[PDB]
Enzyme design. Structure first.
Site, PDB file in Angstrom:
ATOM      1  N   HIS A   9       0.837  -1.250   0.000  1.00  0.00           N
ATOM      2  CA  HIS A   9       0.000   0.000   0.000  1.00  0.00           C
ATOM      3  C   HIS A   9       0.851   1.271   0.000  1.00  0.00           C
ATOM      4  O   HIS A   9       0.470   2.295   0.579  1.00  0.00           O
ATOM      5  CB  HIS A   9      -0.898  -0.002   1.258  1.00  0.00           C
ATOM      6  CG  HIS A   9      -1.890  -1.159   1.275  1.00  0.00           C
ATOM      7  ND1 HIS A   9      -3.171  -1.007   0.859  1.00  0.00           N
ATOM      8  CD2 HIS A   9      -1.751  -2.467   1.644  1.00  0.00           C
ATOM      9  CE1 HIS A   9      -3.849  -2.163   1.024  1.00  0.00           C
ATOM     10  NE2 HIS A   9      -2.977  -3.093   1.452  1.00  0.00           N
TER      11      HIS A   9
ATOM     12  N   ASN B 155      -9.942  -3.053   3.408  1.00  0.00           N
ATOM     13  CA  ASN B 155      -9.716  -3.040   1.954  1.00  0.00           C
ATOM     14  C   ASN B 155     -11.082  -2.865   1.303  1.00  0.00           C
ATOM     15  O   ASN B 155     -12.128  -2.843   2.009  1.00  0.00           O
ATOM     16  CB  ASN B 155      -9.156  -4.401   1.502  1.00  0.00           C
ATOM     17  CG  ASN B 155      -7.646  -4.518   1.620  1.00  0.00           C
ATOM     18  OD1 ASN B 155      -6.920  -3.508   1.844  1.00  0.00           O
ATOM     19  ND2 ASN B 155      -7.148  -5.769   1.572  1.00  0.00           N
TER      20      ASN B 155
ATOM     21  N   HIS C  63      -2.594   0.934  12.114  1.00  0.00           N
ATOM     22  CA  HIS C  63      -2.259  -0.444  12.485  1.00  0.00           C
ATOM     23  C   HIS C  63      -3.489  -1.114  13.123  1.00  0.00           C
ATOM     24  O   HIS C  63      -4.130  -0.547  14.083  1.00  0.00           O
ATOM     25  CB  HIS C  63      -1.025  -0.381  13.414  1.00  0.00           C
ATOM     26  CG  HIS C  63      -0.643  -1.737  13.979  1.00  0.00           C
ATOM     27  ND1 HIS C  63       0.066  -2.708  13.238  1.00  0.00           N
ATOM     28  CD2 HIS C  63      -0.973  -2.300  15.134  1.00  0.00           C
ATOM     29  CE1 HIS C  63       0.191  -3.852  14.015  1.00  0.00           C
ATOM     30  NE2 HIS C  63      -0.433  -3.612  15.190  1.00  0.00           N
TER      31      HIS C  63
ATOM     32  N   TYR D   9       2.458  -4.553  12.001  1.00  0.00           N
ATOM     33  CA  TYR D   9       2.416  -3.095  11.783  1.00  0.00           C
ATOM     34  C   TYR D   9       3.312  -2.294  12.726  1.00  0.00           C
ATOM     35  O   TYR D   9       3.962  -1.349  12.232  1.00  0.00           O
ATOM     36  CB  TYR D   9       0.985  -2.533  11.805  1.00  0.00           C
ATOM     37  CG  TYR D   9       0.135  -3.074  10.731  1.00  0.00           C
ATOM     38  CD1 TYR D   9      -0.336  -2.225   9.714  1.00  0.00           C
ATOM     39  CD2 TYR D   9      -0.330  -4.475  10.714  1.00  0.00           C
ATOM     40  CE1 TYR D   9      -1.168  -2.762   8.704  1.00  0.00           C
ATOM     41  CE2 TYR D   9      -1.031  -4.965   9.654  1.00  0.00           C
ATOM     42  CZ  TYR D   9      -1.517  -4.073   8.721  1.00  0.00           C
ATOM     43  OH  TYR D   9      -2.334  -4.504   7.678  1.00  0.00           O
TER      44      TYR D   9
HETATM   45  C1  HEM Z   1      -7.238  -8.561   6.034  1.00  0.00           C
HETATM   46  C2  HEM Z   1      -6.092  -8.532   5.424  1.00  0.00           C
HETATM   47  C3  HEM Z   1      -5.386  -7.217   5.377  1.00  0.00           C
HETATM   48  C4  HEM Z   1      -5.968  -5.915   5.102  1.00  0.00           C
HETATM   49  C5  HEM Z   1      -7.363  -5.531   4.900  1.00  0.00           C
HETATM   50  C6  HEM Z   1      -4.740  -5.072   5.125  1.00  0.00           C
HETATM   51  C7  HEM Z   1      -4.891  -3.669   4.818  1.00  0.00           C
HETATM   52  C8  HEM Z   1      -3.817  -2.783   4.700  1.00  0.00           C
HETATM   53  C9  HEM Z   1      -3.929  -1.390   4.397  1.00  0.00           C
HETATM   54  C10 HEM Z   1      -5.235  -0.688   4.016  1.00  0.00           C
HETATM   55  C11 HEM Z   1      -2.597  -0.809   4.567  1.00  0.00           C
HETATM   56  C12 HEM Z   1      -2.166   0.619   4.322  1.00  0.00           C
HETATM   57  C13 HEM Z   1      -2.467   1.508   5.562  1.00  0.00           C
HETATM   58  C14 HEM Z   1      -2.034   2.889   5.122  1.00  0.00           C
HETATM   59  O1  HEM Z   1      -2.773   3.485   4.320  1.00  0.00           O
HETATM   60  O2  HEM Z   1      -0.915   3.348   5.504  1.00  0.00           O
HETATM   61  C15 HEM Z   1      -1.733  -1.923   4.959  1.00  0.00           C
HETATM   62  C16 HEM Z   1      -0.341  -1.758   5.231  1.00  0.00           C
HETATM   63  C17 HEM Z   1       0.484  -2.814   5.670  1.00  0.00           C
HETATM   64  N1  HEM Z   1       0.038  -4.094   5.863  1.00  0.00           N
HETATM   65 FE1  HEM Z   1      -1.813  -4.876   5.842  1.00  0.00          FE
HETATM   66  N2  HEM Z   1      -3.594  -5.736   5.338  1.00  0.00           N
HETATM   67  C18 HEM Z   1      -3.987  -7.042   5.597  1.00  0.00           C
HETATM   68  C19 HEM Z   1      -3.068  -8.141   5.811  1.00  0.00           C
HETATM   69  C20 HEM Z   1      -1.696  -7.936   6.136  1.00  0.00           C
HETATM   70  C21 HEM Z   1      -0.906  -9.050   6.643  1.00  0.00           C
HETATM   71  C22 HEM Z   1      -1.320 -10.519   6.942  1.00  0.00           C
HETATM   72  C23 HEM Z   1       0.293  -8.414   7.046  1.00  0.00           C
HETATM   73  C24 HEM Z   1       1.555  -8.982   7.584  1.00  0.00           C
HETATM   74  C25 HEM Z   1       1.448 -10.004   8.452  1.00  0.00           C
HETATM   75  C26 HEM Z   1       0.225  -7.011   6.657  1.00  0.00           C
HETATM   76  C27 HEM Z   1       1.317  -6.104   6.783  1.00  0.00           C
HETATM   77  C28 HEM Z   1       1.176  -4.728   6.367  1.00  0.00           C
HETATM   78  C29 HEM Z   1       2.344  -3.881   6.427  1.00  0.00           C
HETATM   79  C30 HEM Z   1       3.746  -4.218   6.880  1.00  0.00           C
HETATM   80  C31 HEM Z   1       1.866  -2.593   6.000  1.00  0.00           C
HETATM   81  C32 HEM Z   1       2.741  -1.377   5.910  1.00  0.00           C
HETATM   82  C33 HEM Z   1       2.195  -0.504   7.111  1.00  0.00           C
HETATM   83  C34 HEM Z   1       3.064   0.716   7.372  1.00  0.00           C
HETATM   84  O3  HEM Z   1       4.182   0.812   6.793  1.00  0.00           O
HETATM   85  O4  HEM Z   1       2.641   1.649   8.113  1.00  0.00           O
HETATM   86  N3  HEM Z   1      -1.011  -6.654   6.043  1.00  0.00           N
HETATM   87  N4  HEM Z   1      -2.446  -3.170   5.018  1.00  0.00           N
END
Ligand code: HEM
Ligand code: HEM
Lengths: 726, 726
Positions: free
Chosen positions: B101, B174, B365, B388
């Site tokens: 993202h 999402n 987060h 996060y």
């Molecule tokens: C239901 C499944 C998931 C949804 C709906 C989701 C949704 C999102 C969204 C919307 C963002 C961006 C937030 C922003 O705008 O800064 C994001 C960032 C991220 N997601 Fe998730 N995600 C999911 C699953 C995962 C999984 C399983 C992991 C790791 C175990 C993960 C790791 C991350 C990481 C590392 C970021 C970067 C956040 C940051 O740098 O601040 N995501 N995700």
């Protein structure tokens, strides 16, 4: 075992044309292509086949599909160190992108001089024609992020790291011979003005916004490189078909201590070629990775990018002999005044194995020079020397970035520097300072000398007071823009006008457009009028009367400044779309495919669906892509063989394929009943220049098509395209 | 003074339609728009007018145009601390982009519930319909980098930070109601496979490549979210016109301690609407910032994005009552089985001031919950809780990321944590540990209770052995894809078939194509066969005989899963292109603009050049953009008024504008002699639904056009578009 049993998952380790096989890491695609730097990277290359999956501590993993939980539907436990090591490493994969030139594509290769240059420079890598120097080259755009598109209108970067026996030399150039600004102190202002605007972070990869033209209108020094960016130089067909320049005057220093001024050039052995704007902009949508892809696939095909290094040399006694200052990076040195002397050849012949490790972490810096070279007081160069060292400390995590494997010298390096983040080298020297007795003063200083000497700066005289002041010799802004303009063909001048017109149309504040138009009128009144007319602007009587700036040392044009005025076309490595039908004349297809192969021109067979079609004689033709999948934007020419034309004649995609290719000035060849497509592109019965047509693809049809391909585009068609709706 | 005399450099601080004024920082565009979070950022807002330019140490600069040198053509001096500070800061601008993202667009706004939810949750932000909670929302794509394009085919993120009186709650969701994978342990696998491939780092923003389909073909749990991605859900018209979902089942906890399972939903009050693929893909090239721009401009216009928060609620005793596991994030809860209860409304009403400071540095987060909420054992959510916090330590430079102004709570925060890089808070507490006596143990723990209580986890029973095992109840992969497929309209189904056919044609290894078609045959044979035919693949007899998966708890369809089956169109905020000529009929323009204004639809006036044209009554009309500069891709419908139609009738660009709008299923309206354009798009004299036509542009003409716009596109035209060459 999940691989297909036929082994089709693995590409052949031999040269293959674009699309014939999946691409691969360079050491698996071309294991026998070697050089000293690629060999020295062996210590850090990691394979995979036949090895157990482990943590980073070497512990074998049994189940890489599941987290550890209390019950198969229960909560995940903190003690799962395998989950946490894998997610921690993923969570920290990104590093800061480069502050400019974030989007770039790189390859390995080698350089050799044609003759010894010891009479003019003691640089070891130029001393002997049998001395081969490994290189790593990165090509880039300037403004957009690492995920931005390749075929934007922008200056390109052309950065070469020479791993020499006396030190790394980085020649960090661009694809135009001047820069936008005169003193490094302005570089954050200029880059901030061209980058996305700070409230909303728009636009990406584009100068078509108000802040860029605000700065330009207020800083006429920028106008020269603006002219080049607005020309078709701003939209190269490939990194293989652009020029390179070091921009600054540097010095060469020979063993007798004589300095000679030099400007560095790269000439593309494949010739100079650019896209047209609408095609370039469309391509940013259909394949934002087109130049990256083209570079990698040319290498996998054996169509190695080759460039010739050349030097413009000026004696010290001639520093003040020109109408412009040699130290001014907004001024070019016309080749009519100072010819480029050919120096050597660079071949790029292997792709990286891992883009992040080798391309993304690569660090080039124009301060990395070697004995035999030196700097000048160009006030833009002088500030670059501070910047590249500094930026690399945050981008690459510390002061040991030279230990990252792509950046390591291949020659010895020893000194008294210690520690820092990420320190790899384990120093055993008892001493970490000099002078010392406890290690008999090793490693020791080396006096300068003709070969293998220490670096000493050329003893240039400095005289003046400590000032923040621009040299009056730099205070002239319009004569080089005018020289460039008058050097272009009439169709290149049309594209420059269209460049300015399209782009200033996106500036929201109209007074900025009017200010730019006023600067154009100080360059050339014909340019300024053509751009004003497109913008609905009327020049004032005052503007119509501005006197043109002077000629540059008596020059009213220099054809070396045009992409196209002097033919240098080369078809090898280009690609043609062939639009199939369900009953292709197999004899047309034999003649077309073998003539293209004989000249190293690639083909892509296109249809309305994937799979195969069957020719009149039963030959099974495998389809590469669909008409929508591989649009005309991605090829250099279009051939339609005879057969059952009614199969595709009413296919909107096939007709639009030809309409788009025609608009974009590409050669089109129509055999047999394919001539029915003449109505789609409005071609007269007795035909027209740039459309090859015959009863069949035999006799002279392929020679005629290939002759058009050598001229790149059908410029003569420009006034005919304005009508077609494409 | 550099500004123009008339004050036109500065946009009016009032709501204006898109293109009427240059865009600006939110606090300057809308100074009277406030909320508790926007006000709290006042300590760190910095103005500029009437202030002197200084170093970061407060020293006034006299000459910001030049480095310090010894003579005005001399070398730059090391003692130039002004140059080195300015260039140091520039050199260190970038920070790592988000691992996923990385491309996103954000705004401030506010939320408030419709009624108190205290029967089901003690969360303070849901406790009072008159207690307003500030929010900051970021929308994003998944795969591409921060500089990739907006209108790619991808899943979108919808992340909301609620600044509640009892702590920050981040709902990080999402735009589809499931995820691709079941266990967080696989996320780095899945992300690696979708992201650019590691050798060459291609393709950006696209799942059209071998590794992603390799992963999908070997991990059928992915198929559900793959269906959503291949539908027009993958290409929304705007972030205002898509759904949001938290995906996981969470818990609500009330004051009596009762847990209710919940899934979170956002309903777009502007309605659901998506692009068509050819439009989306061309728009990545013509405006790769389209969604970022459209969001910012809607807010500047007063068309504030509005969403309704909705809860699906399942009693604790109904955990196992469905055909699917509630803890499985590849499974959705059909609204036919469990209705979404409306909960409150969110309005985004102000843009940020600085994109880097507020958007790029924002940290969301899903572990940031508050009392009244809790987690469940969903094994994808369980691993997100680790990730996060971890990733924000490197991305944002240390453990004090909550002191970066956008991330700060607006409620009190006090604890014994200390130090870390870029520590802002200066703690005065004599104690940095508890229990302590030297500060009488403050700040103190707070027992849980009905309001203002400390956080206590719901005491779920856990019973199982320590295992790395996927629950058997998760091992069903085809029934939800099939439900989704059957719930789509016939045209939506065609677009899914076309999404799979276009994408898998770009997969190089043919056996991966074949293995995906085999997966599709386990979902729906009609889908599997239509994709196979476009790929030149013949289904085997075994594949033709695969038994369809079971209905989902008796459902053969659920229309809430379609974008379009139930009308919810809203025209406010949409935009029409008006194609001008050099003698426009002013009576047509009056009527068109008055009807558009009445419904809050914006207009952009286009011509073949910039500047102005004059109408038949002398009204001077400023031109927004040229027919090429603002293509039909960027509007919702096209109107051509009468006037001097010969001026534009044989303009290629005007004809092509109509052909593209027609192909992309947009309403077109033609008044008077503009009806001559019917011939370019092959409309019969009797006319066609989706083309509005009349002798002039009256009330009736505009009502019909606005009706067509409310249904978004003209699906009935699909059979007619394949033969148009556009
Ligand atoms: C239901 C499944 C998931 C949804 C709906 C989701 C949704 C999102 C969204 C919307 C963002 C961006 C937030 C922003 O705008 O800064 C994001 C960032 C991220 N997601 Fe998730 N995600 C999911 C699953 C995962 C999984 C399983 C992991 C790791 C175990 C993960 C790791 C991350 C990481 C590392 C970021 C970067 C956040 C940051 O740098 O601040 N995501 N995700
Ligand atoms: C003749 C004018 C210049 C040319 C030809 C030039 C060329 C380049 C090229 C080709 C790159 C990318 C190297 C790569 O592929 O990694 C680059 C990066 C860079 N440039 Fe320059 N540049 C110019 C002027 C400047 C000035 C005046 C400054 C600052 C004073 C500057 C600061 C940078 C920095 C900070 C980077 C990124 C380096 C990195 O992160 O490793 N550039 N420039």
């Amino acid at each position: 075992s999940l691989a297909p049993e036929d082994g089709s998952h693995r590409p052949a380790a031999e040269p293959t044309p674009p699309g014939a096989q999946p691409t691969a890491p360079g050491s698996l695609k071309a294991p026998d292509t070697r050089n000293e730097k690629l060999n020295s990277l062996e210590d850090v290359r990691k394979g995979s086949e036949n090895y157990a999956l482990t943590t980073n501590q070497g512990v074998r993993i049994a189940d890489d599909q599941n987290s550890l939980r209390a019950g198969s539907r229960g909560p995940t436990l903190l003690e799962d160190f395998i989950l946490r090591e894998k997610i921690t490493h993923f969570d920290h994969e990104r590093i800061p992108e480069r502050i400019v030139h974030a989007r770039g594509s790189a390859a390995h290769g080698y350089f050799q001089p044609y003759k010894s240059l010891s009479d003019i420079t003691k640089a070891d890598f130029l001393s002997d024609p049998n001395k081969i120097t490994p290189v790593f080259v990165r090509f880039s755009t300037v403004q957009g992020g690492a995920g931005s598109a390749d075929t934007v209108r922008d200056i390109r970067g052309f950065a070469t790291k020479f791993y020499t026996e006396e030190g790394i030399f980085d020649l960090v150039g661009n694809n135009t011979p001047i820069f936008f600004i005169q003193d490094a102190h302005k570089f954050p202002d200029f880059v901030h003005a061209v980058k996305p605007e700070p409230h909303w972070a728009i636009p990406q990869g584009q100068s078509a916004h108000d802040t860029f033209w605000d700065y330009v209108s207020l800083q006429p020094e920028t106008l020269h490189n603006v002219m080049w960016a607005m020309s078709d130089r701003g939209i190269p067909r490939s990194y293989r078909t652009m020029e390179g320049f070091g921009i600054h005057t540097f010095r060469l220093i020979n063993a007798e201590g004589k300095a000679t001024f030099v400007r560095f050039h790269w000439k593309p052995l494949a010739g100079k070629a650019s896209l047209v704007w609408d095609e370039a902009q469309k391509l940013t949508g259909r394949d934002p990775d087109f130049h990256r892809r083209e570079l990698w696939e040319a290498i996998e095909a054996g169509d190695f990018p080759e460039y010739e290094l050349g030097f413009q040399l000026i004696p010290e006694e001639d520093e003040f002999k020109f109408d412009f200052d040699l130290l001014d990076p907004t001024k070019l040195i016309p080749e009519e005044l100072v010819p480029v002397q050919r120096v050597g050849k660079m071949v790029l012949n292997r792709n990286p194995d891992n883009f992040f490790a080798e391309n993304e972490q690569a660090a080039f810096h124009p301060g990395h020079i070697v004995p035999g070279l030196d700097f000048t007081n160009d006030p833009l160069l002088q500030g670059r020397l501070f910047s590249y060292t500094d930026t690399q400390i945050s981008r690459l995590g510390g002061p040991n970035f030279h230990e990252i494997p792509i950046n390591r010298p291949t020659c010895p390096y020893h000194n008294f520097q210690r520690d820092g983040m990420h320190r790899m080298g384990i120093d055993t020297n008892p001493a970490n300072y000099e002078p010392n007795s406890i290690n008999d003063n090793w490693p020791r200083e080396t006096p300068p000398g003709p070969k293998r000497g220490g670096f000493e700066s050329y003893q240039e005289r400095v005289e003046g007071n400590k000032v923040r002041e621009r040299s009056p010799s730099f205070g002239e802004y319009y004569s080089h823009p005018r020289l460039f303009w008058l050097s272009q063909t009439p169709f290149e001048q049309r594209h420059i006008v269209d460049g300015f017109s399209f782009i200033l149309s996106k500036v929201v504040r109209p007074y900025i457009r009017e200010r730019v138009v006023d600067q154009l009128a100080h360059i050339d009144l014909t340019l300024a009028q053509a751009v004003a007319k497109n913008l609905g602007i009327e020049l004032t009587d005052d503007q119509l009367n501005i006197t043109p700036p002077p000629d540059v040392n008596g020059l009213k044009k220099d054809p070396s400044l045009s992409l196209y005025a002097i033919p240098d076309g080369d078809v090898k490595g280009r690609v043609v779309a062939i639009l199939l039908n369900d009953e292709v004349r197999s004899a047309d297809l034999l003649a077309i495919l073998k003539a293209l192969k004989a000249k190293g021109v690639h083909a892509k067979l296109l249809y309305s669906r994937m799979g195969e079609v069957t020719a009149d004689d039963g030959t099974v033709l495998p389809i590469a892509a669909t008409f929508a999948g591989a649009p005309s934007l991605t090829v250099d020419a279009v051939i339609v063989p005879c057969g059952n034309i009614a199969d595709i004649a009413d296919n909107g995609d096939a007709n639009y394929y030809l309409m788009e290719a025609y608009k974009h000035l590409k050669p089109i060849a129509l055999a047999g009943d394919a001539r029915k497509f003449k109505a789609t592109i409005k071609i007269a019965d007795q035909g027209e220049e740039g459309i090859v047509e015959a009863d069949s693809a035999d006799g002279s049809f392929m020679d005629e098509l290939l002759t058009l391909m050598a001229a790149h585009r059908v410029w003569s068609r420009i006034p005919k395209i304005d009508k077609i709706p494409a």
